[PDB]
Short mmCIF file of all heavy atoms in Angstrom, two decimals:
data_model
loop_
_atom_site.label_atom_id
_atom_site.label_comp_id
_atom_site.label_asym_id
_atom_site.label_seq_id
_atom_site.Cartn_x
_atom_site.Cartn_y
_atom_site.Cartn_z
N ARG A 27 14.77 2.10 -6.21
CA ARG A 27 13.82 2.34 -7.28
C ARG A 27 12.46 2.71 -6.72
O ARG A 27 12.05 2.21 -5.66
CB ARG A 27 13.71 1.09 -8.16
CG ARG A 27 15.04 0.67 -8.76
CD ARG A 27 14.90 -0.52 -9.68
NE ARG A 27 16.12 -0.66 -10.47
CZ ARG A 27 16.32 -1.57 -11.42
NH1 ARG A 27 15.37 -2.46 -11.73
NH2 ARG A 27 17.47 -1.59 -12.06
N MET A 28 11.76 3.60 -7.42
CA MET A 28 10.43 3.98 -7.00
C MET A 28 9.43 2.92 -7.43
O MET A 28 9.27 2.65 -8.61
CB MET A 28 10.03 5.35 -7.56
CG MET A 28 8.69 5.87 -7.05
SD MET A 28 8.74 6.49 -5.36
CE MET A 28 9.55 8.06 -5.60
N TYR A 29 8.77 2.30 -6.46
CA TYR A 29 7.68 1.38 -6.76
C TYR A 29 6.41 1.91 -6.13
O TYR A 29 6.47 2.76 -5.25
CB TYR A 29 7.98 -0.05 -6.29
CG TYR A 29 9.21 -0.68 -6.91
CD1 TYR A 29 10.35 -0.92 -6.13
CD2 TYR A 29 9.24 -1.06 -8.25
CE1 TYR A 29 11.49 -1.50 -6.68
CE2 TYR A 29 10.37 -1.64 -8.81
CZ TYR A 29 11.49 -1.86 -8.02
OH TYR A 29 12.62 -2.44 -8.56
N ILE A 30 5.27 1.40 -6.56
CA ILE A 30 3.98 1.81 -6.02
C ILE A 30 3.90 1.69 -4.50
O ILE A 30 3.17 2.45 -3.86
CB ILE A 30 2.80 1.08 -6.70
CG1 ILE A 30 2.91 -0.45 -6.55
CG2 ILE A 30 2.73 1.50 -8.17
CD1 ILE A 30 1.61 -1.21 -6.85
N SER A 31 4.68 0.77 -3.93
CA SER A 31 4.75 0.58 -2.49
C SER A 31 5.36 1.79 -1.77
O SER A 31 4.98 2.12 -0.64
CB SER A 31 5.51 -0.72 -2.15
OG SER A 31 6.89 -0.62 -2.49
N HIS A 32 6.29 2.47 -2.43
CA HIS A 32 6.88 3.69 -1.89
C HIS A 32 5.89 4.86 -1.99
O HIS A 32 5.83 5.70 -1.09
CB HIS A 32 8.20 4.01 -2.59
CG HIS A 32 9.22 2.93 -2.46
ND1 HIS A 32 9.63 2.16 -3.53
CD2 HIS A 32 9.91 2.47 -1.39
CE1 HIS A 32 10.52 1.27 -3.12
NE2 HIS A 32 10.72 1.45 -1.83
N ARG A 33 5.12 4.90 -3.08
CA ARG A 33 4.03 5.85 -3.24
C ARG A 33 2.94 5.62 -2.20
O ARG A 33 2.45 6.57 -1.62
CB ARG A 33 3.45 5.75 -4.65
CG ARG A 33 4.42 6.14 -5.74
CD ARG A 33 5.04 7.51 -5.46
NE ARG A 33 5.64 8.05 -6.67
CZ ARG A 33 6.33 9.18 -6.72
NH1 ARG A 33 6.53 9.89 -5.63
NH2 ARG A 33 6.84 9.58 -7.88
N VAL A 34 2.59 4.35 -1.97
CA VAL A 34 1.66 3.96 -0.89
C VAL A 34 2.12 4.52 0.46
O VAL A 34 1.31 5.06 1.22
CB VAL A 34 1.49 2.41 -0.81
CG1 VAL A 34 0.74 1.99 0.46
CG2 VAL A 34 0.77 1.89 -2.03
N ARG A 35 3.41 4.39 0.75
CA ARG A 35 3.99 4.94 1.97
C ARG A 35 3.89 6.47 2.00
O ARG A 35 3.56 7.05 3.04
CB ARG A 35 5.44 4.48 2.13
CG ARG A 35 6.07 4.90 3.46
CD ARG A 35 7.42 4.29 3.68
NE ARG A 35 8.05 4.85 4.87
CZ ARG A 35 9.27 4.53 5.32
NH1 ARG A 35 10.02 3.65 4.66
NH2 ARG A 35 9.73 5.10 6.42
N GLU A 36 4.16 7.12 0.87
CA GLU A 36 4.04 8.57 0.74
C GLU A 36 2.61 9.03 0.96
O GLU A 36 2.38 10.16 1.42
CB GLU A 36 4.49 9.00 -0.64
CG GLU A 36 5.99 9.07 -0.82
CD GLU A 36 6.38 9.61 -2.17
OE1 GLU A 36 5.49 9.74 -3.03
OE2 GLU A 36 7.57 9.92 -2.38
N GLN A 37 1.68 8.15 0.64
CA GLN A 37 0.25 8.39 0.72
C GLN A 37 -0.35 7.75 1.97
O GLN A 37 -1.46 7.22 1.94
CB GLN A 37 -0.42 7.87 -0.54
CG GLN A 37 -0.01 8.65 -1.79
CD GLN A 37 -0.30 10.12 -1.65
OE1 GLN A 37 -1.35 10.50 -1.17
NE2 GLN A 37 0.65 10.96 -2.06
N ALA A 38 0.40 7.82 3.07
CA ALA A 38 0.04 7.16 4.32
C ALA A 38 -1.31 7.62 4.84
O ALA A 38 -2.09 6.81 5.33
CB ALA A 38 1.13 7.37 5.37
N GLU A 39 -1.57 8.92 4.73
CA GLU A 39 -2.82 9.51 5.22
C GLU A 39 -4.03 9.06 4.41
O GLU A 39 -5.09 8.79 4.98
CB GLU A 39 -2.73 11.04 5.29
CG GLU A 39 -1.58 11.58 6.15
CD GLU A 39 -1.81 11.41 7.66
OE1 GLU A 39 -2.54 12.24 8.26
OE2 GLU A 39 -1.22 10.46 8.25
N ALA A 40 -3.87 8.99 3.08
CA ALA A 40 -4.91 8.46 2.19
C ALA A 40 -5.15 6.97 2.44
O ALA A 40 -6.30 6.51 2.45
CB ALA A 40 -4.55 8.68 0.74
N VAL A 41 -4.06 6.24 2.67
CA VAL A 41 -4.12 4.82 3.01
C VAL A 41 -4.87 4.65 4.33
O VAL A 41 -5.75 3.79 4.44
CB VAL A 41 -2.69 4.18 3.07
CG1 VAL A 41 -2.71 2.80 3.72
CG2 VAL A 41 -2.07 4.11 1.67
N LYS A 42 -4.54 5.49 5.31
CA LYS A 42 -5.23 5.53 6.61
C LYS A 42 -6.71 5.92 6.50
O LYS A 42 -7.53 5.42 7.26
CB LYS A 42 -4.54 6.49 7.57
CG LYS A 42 -3.29 5.94 8.25
CD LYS A 42 -2.53 7.06 8.97
CE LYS A 42 -1.12 6.62 9.33
NZ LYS A 42 -0.13 7.72 9.16
N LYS A 43 -7.04 6.83 5.58
CA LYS A 43 -8.45 7.17 5.32
C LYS A 43 -9.20 5.95 4.83
O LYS A 43 -10.37 5.76 5.17
CB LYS A 43 -8.58 8.28 4.27
CG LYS A 43 -8.33 9.70 4.78
CD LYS A 43 -8.88 10.74 3.82
CE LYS A 43 -8.21 12.11 4.01
NZ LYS A 43 -6.94 12.21 3.21
N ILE A 44 -8.53 5.12 4.04
CA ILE A 44 -9.11 3.87 3.53
C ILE A 44 -9.22 2.82 4.63
O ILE A 44 -10.29 2.25 4.84
CB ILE A 44 -8.32 3.37 2.30
CG1 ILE A 44 -8.41 4.42 1.18
CG2 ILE A 44 -8.84 2.02 1.83
CD1 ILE A 44 -7.67 4.07 -0.04
N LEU A 45 -8.12 2.60 5.35
CA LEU A 45 -8.09 1.64 6.45
C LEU A 45 -9.16 1.90 7.49
O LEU A 45 -9.79 0.97 7.98
CB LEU A 45 -6.71 1.61 7.10
CG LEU A 45 -5.60 0.97 6.27
CD1 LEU A 45 -4.23 1.33 6.83
CD2 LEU A 45 -5.77 -0.53 6.16
N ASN A 46 -9.37 3.18 7.80
CA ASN A 46 -10.26 3.59 8.89
C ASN A 46 -11.66 3.96 8.44
O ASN A 46 -12.59 3.97 9.26
CB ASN A 46 -9.68 4.79 9.66
CG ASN A 46 -8.38 4.47 10.34
OD1 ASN A 46 -8.07 3.30 10.60
ND2 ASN A 46 -7.60 5.50 10.65
N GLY A 47 -11.80 4.29 7.16
CA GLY A 47 -13.06 4.80 6.63
C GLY A 47 -13.82 3.88 5.69
O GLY A 47 -14.68 4.34 4.94
N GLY A 48 -13.50 2.58 5.71
CA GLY A 48 -14.26 1.58 4.96
C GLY A 48 -14.01 1.60 3.46
O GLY A 48 -14.81 1.08 2.68
N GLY A 49 -12.90 2.20 3.05
CA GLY A 49 -12.55 2.25 1.64
C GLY A 49 -11.92 0.96 1.18
O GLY A 49 -11.81 0.02 1.95
N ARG A 50 -11.47 0.94 -0.07
CA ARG A 50 -10.91 -0.26 -0.67
C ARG A 50 -9.56 -0.01 -1.34
O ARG A 50 -9.36 1.04 -1.94
CB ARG A 50 -11.87 -0.82 -1.72
CG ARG A 50 -13.23 -1.15 -1.18
CD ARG A 50 -14.17 -1.47 -2.29
NE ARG A 50 -15.41 -2.02 -1.76
CZ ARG A 50 -16.09 -3.01 -2.32
NH1 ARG A 50 -15.64 -3.56 -3.44
NH2 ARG A 50 -17.21 -3.45 -1.76
N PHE A 51 -8.66 -0.98 -1.21
CA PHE A 51 -7.45 -1.07 -2.02
C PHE A 51 -7.67 -2.11 -3.11
O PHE A 51 -8.11 -3.22 -2.82
CB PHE A 51 -6.25 -1.51 -1.19
CG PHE A 51 -5.99 -0.66 0.02
CD1 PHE A 51 -6.43 -1.06 1.28
CD2 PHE A 51 -5.29 0.54 -0.10
CE1 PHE A 51 -6.18 -0.27 2.41
CE2 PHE A 51 -5.03 1.33 1.02
CZ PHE A 51 -5.48 0.92 2.27
N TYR A 52 -7.39 -1.75 -4.36
CA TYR A 52 -7.34 -2.71 -5.47
C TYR A 52 -5.92 -2.77 -5.99
O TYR A 52 -5.35 -1.75 -6.35
CB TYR A 52 -8.28 -2.33 -6.62
CG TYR A 52 -9.75 -2.37 -6.31
CD1 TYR A 52 -10.34 -1.37 -5.51
CD2 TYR A 52 -10.56 -3.39 -6.81
CE1 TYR A 52 -11.69 -1.40 -5.22
CE2 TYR A 52 -11.91 -3.42 -6.52
CZ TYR A 52 -12.47 -2.42 -5.72
OH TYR A 52 -13.79 -2.44 -5.42
N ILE A 53 -5.36 -3.97 -6.04
CA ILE A 53 -4.00 -4.15 -6.50
C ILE A 53 -4.02 -5.09 -7.69
O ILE A 53 -4.48 -6.22 -7.60
CB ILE A 53 -3.07 -4.67 -5.39
CG1 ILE A 53 -3.26 -3.87 -4.09
CG2 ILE A 53 -1.60 -4.68 -5.85
CD1 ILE A 53 -2.61 -4.47 -2.90
N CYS A 54 -3.55 -4.59 -8.83
CA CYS A 54 -3.54 -5.37 -10.04
C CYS A 54 -2.22 -5.16 -10.77
O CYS A 54 -1.70 -4.05 -10.82
CB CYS A 54 -4.73 -4.99 -10.94
SG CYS A 54 -4.88 -5.99 -12.44
N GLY A 55 -1.68 -6.25 -11.31
CA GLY A 55 -0.48 -6.17 -12.13
C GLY A 55 0.54 -7.26 -11.86
O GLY A 55 0.21 -8.34 -11.39
N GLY A 56 1.78 -6.97 -12.18
CA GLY A 56 2.84 -7.94 -12.02
C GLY A 56 4.03 -7.40 -11.26
O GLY A 56 4.12 -6.21 -11.00
N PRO A 57 4.97 -8.30 -10.92
CA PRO A 57 4.82 -9.73 -11.20
C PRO A 57 3.84 -10.40 -10.22
O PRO A 57 3.33 -9.73 -9.32
CB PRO A 57 6.24 -10.28 -11.03
CG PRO A 57 6.88 -9.35 -10.08
CD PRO A 57 6.26 -8.00 -10.27
N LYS A 58 3.56 -11.68 -10.42
CA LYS A 58 2.70 -12.41 -9.50
C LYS A 58 3.21 -12.27 -8.05
O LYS A 58 4.39 -12.43 -7.77
CB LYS A 58 2.60 -13.88 -9.92
CG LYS A 58 1.52 -14.67 -9.19
CD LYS A 58 1.32 -16.06 -9.80
CE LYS A 58 0.08 -16.74 -9.23
NZ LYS A 58 -1.14 -15.89 -9.37
N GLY A 59 2.29 -11.94 -7.14
CA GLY A 59 2.63 -11.76 -5.73
C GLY A 59 3.23 -10.41 -5.40
O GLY A 59 3.84 -10.26 -4.35
N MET A 60 3.07 -9.44 -6.29
CA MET A 60 3.60 -8.09 -6.07
C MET A 60 2.75 -7.30 -5.08
O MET A 60 3.16 -6.26 -4.60
CB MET A 60 3.73 -7.30 -7.38
CG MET A 60 2.42 -6.87 -8.02
SD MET A 60 1.68 -5.36 -7.36
CE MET A 60 0.54 -4.96 -8.67
N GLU A 61 1.56 -7.82 -4.81
CA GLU A 61 0.65 -7.21 -3.87
C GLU A 61 1.21 -7.29 -2.46
O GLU A 61 0.82 -6.49 -1.60
CB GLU A 61 -0.70 -7.92 -3.93
CG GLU A 61 -0.74 -9.28 -3.21
CD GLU A 61 -0.47 -10.44 -4.13
OE1 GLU A 61 -0.15 -10.24 -5.32
OE2 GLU A 61 -0.59 -11.59 -3.66
N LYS A 62 2.11 -8.25 -2.23
CA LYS A 62 2.68 -8.48 -0.91
C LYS A 62 3.40 -7.25 -0.43
O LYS A 62 3.14 -6.78 0.67
CB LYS A 62 3.63 -9.68 -0.88
CG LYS A 62 4.08 -10.05 0.54
CD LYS A 62 5.15 -11.11 0.54
CE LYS A 62 5.58 -11.44 1.96
NZ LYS A 62 4.65 -12.38 2.63
N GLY A 63 4.30 -6.73 -1.26
CA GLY A 63 5.06 -5.52 -0.95
C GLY A 63 4.18 -4.32 -0.70
O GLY A 63 4.45 -3.50 0.19
N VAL A 64 3.11 -4.22 -1.49
CA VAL A 64 2.10 -3.18 -1.35
C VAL A 64 1.29 -3.32 -0.07
O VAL A 64 1.14 -2.35 0.66
CB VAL A 64 1.12 -3.18 -2.54
CG1 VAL A 64 0.08 -2.07 -2.39
CG2 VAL A 64 1.89 -3.04 -3.84
N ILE A 65 0.77 -4.52 0.19
CA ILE A 65 -0.02 -4.79 1.39
C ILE A 65 0.83 -4.60 2.64
O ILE A 65 0.37 -3.98 3.61
CB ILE A 65 -0.69 -6.21 1.35
CG1 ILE A 65 -1.81 -6.23 0.30
CG2 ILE A 65 -1.24 -6.62 2.72
CD1 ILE A 65 -2.13 -7.60 -0.26
N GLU A 66 2.07 -5.09 2.63
CA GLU A 66 2.90 -4.98 3.84
C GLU A 66 3.31 -3.53 4.13
O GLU A 66 3.62 -3.18 5.28
CB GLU A 66 4.05 -6.00 3.89
CG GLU A 66 5.17 -5.84 2.89
CD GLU A 66 5.98 -7.12 2.74
OE1 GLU A 66 5.80 -8.05 3.56
OE2 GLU A 66 6.80 -7.20 1.81
N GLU A 67 3.25 -2.70 3.09
CA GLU A 67 3.42 -1.26 3.20
C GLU A 67 2.16 -0.61 3.77
O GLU A 67 2.23 0.30 4.61
CB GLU A 67 3.76 -0.69 1.82
CG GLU A 67 4.27 0.73 1.85
CD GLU A 67 5.39 0.94 2.85
OE1 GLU A 67 6.53 0.48 2.57
OE2 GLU A 67 5.13 1.58 3.90
N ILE A 68 1.00 -1.08 3.32
CA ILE A 68 -0.28 -0.68 3.90
C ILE A 68 -0.35 -1.13 5.38
O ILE A 68 -0.94 -0.44 6.21
CB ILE A 68 -1.47 -1.27 3.09
CG1 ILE A 68 -1.49 -0.67 1.67
CG2 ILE A 68 -2.80 -1.05 3.82
CD1 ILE A 68 -2.31 -1.44 0.67
N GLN A 69 0.26 -2.27 5.67
CA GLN A 69 0.30 -2.82 7.03
C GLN A 69 1.20 -1.98 7.95
O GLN A 69 0.78 -1.66 9.07
CB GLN A 69 0.74 -4.27 6.99
CG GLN A 69 0.60 -5.01 8.30
CD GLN A 69 1.10 -6.43 8.21
OE1 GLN A 69 1.59 -6.87 7.17
NE2 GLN A 69 0.98 -7.17 9.31
N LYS A 70 2.40 -1.63 7.49
CA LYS A 70 3.26 -0.68 8.20
C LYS A 70 2.49 0.61 8.54
O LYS A 70 2.57 1.10 9.66
CB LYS A 70 4.51 -0.33 7.38
CG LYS A 70 5.58 -1.41 7.36
CD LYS A 70 6.75 -0.97 6.50
CE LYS A 70 7.68 -2.13 6.17
NZ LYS A 70 7.24 -2.81 4.92
N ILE A 71 1.75 1.13 7.56
CA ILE A 71 0.93 2.32 7.76
C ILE A 71 -0.16 2.13 8.83
O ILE A 71 -0.34 3.01 9.68
CB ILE A 71 0.31 2.84 6.42
CG1 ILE A 71 1.39 3.49 5.55
CG2 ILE A 71 -0.82 3.83 6.68
CD1 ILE A 71 1.06 3.50 4.06
N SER A 72 -0.85 1.00 8.79
CA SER A 72 -1.90 0.69 9.77
C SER A 72 -1.36 0.49 11.18
O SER A 72 -2.10 0.62 12.16
CB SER A 72 -2.68 -0.56 9.36
OG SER A 72 -1.91 -1.72 9.59
N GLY A 73 -0.07 0.16 11.29
CA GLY A 73 0.57 -0.13 12.58
C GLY A 73 0.30 -1.55 13.09
O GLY A 73 0.69 -1.89 14.20
N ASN A 74 -0.38 -2.36 12.28
CA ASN A 74 -0.63 -3.79 12.53
C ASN A 74 0.69 -4.55 12.42
O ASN A 74 1.47 -4.33 11.49
CB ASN A 74 -1.63 -4.31 11.49
CG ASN A 74 -2.21 -5.67 11.83
OD1 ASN A 74 -1.63 -6.72 11.53
ND2 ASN A 74 -3.40 -5.66 12.41
#
């Protein structure tokens, strides 16, 4: 299934522009703790 985390991965370069350029990620919605999948996708992108 397509989730925002897969879009985040597709948007690796934009995510990297944020990670490296002082930008911000805002994650809002459900279910509770859904930010984990998103953040860990941002983390895969960062190489951390």
Side-chain angles (χ1 to χ4, degrees):
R27 302 183 166 183
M28 186 75 76
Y29 300 110
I30 59 164
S31 67
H32 301 111
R33 296 308 197 185
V34 170
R35 186 172 173 182
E36 281 185 349
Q37 294 303 317
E39 303 287 280
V41 168
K42 281 169 195 142
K43 281 197 202 86
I44 298 179
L45 288 165
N46 297 338
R50 302 170 170 219
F51 305 99
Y52 294 74
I53 312 169
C54 184
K58 191 171 190 53
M60 71 82 163
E61 77 266 6
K62 188 187 179 81
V64 181
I65 289 155
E66 68 199 349
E67 193 50 73
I68 295 163
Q69 189 182 2
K70 285 179 194 89
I71 287 156
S72 75
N74 194 275

